[PDB]
Amino acid sequence: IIAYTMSLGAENSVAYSNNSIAIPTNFTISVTTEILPVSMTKTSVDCTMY
């Protein structure tokens, strides 16, 4: 078991210039999921029985 300092991620310096742009030449299609709860169990309680 090793304890370390977490790293925020990778690091790059994008090559900015005042007369240069980057344009994509290909593409991909991706499918992702997301899960959302919408309901919880319906319950009832009686006093005198409890």
Ligand X SMILES: *[C@@H]1O[C@H](CO)[C@@H](O[C@@H]2O[C@H](CO)[C@@H](O)[C@H](O)[C@H]2NC(C)=O)[C@H](O)[C@H]1NC(C)=O
Tell me how far, at minimum, the Cβ of 45 lies from other proteins, in Å. 17
Which of 3-32 are b and which e, b meaning 16 or more Cβ less than 10 Å from the residue's Cβ?
eeeeeeeeeeeeeeeeeeeeeeeeeeeeee
Tell me how far, at minimum, the Cβ of 1 lies from other proteins, in Å. 19
Tell me how far, at minimum, the Cβ of 27 lies from other proteins, in Å. 5
CA distance 14 to 20: 12
Q: Does 30 bind ligand X (CB under 6 A)?
A: no
Positions that interact with ligand X (CB under 6 A): 13, 15, 18-19, 22, 26
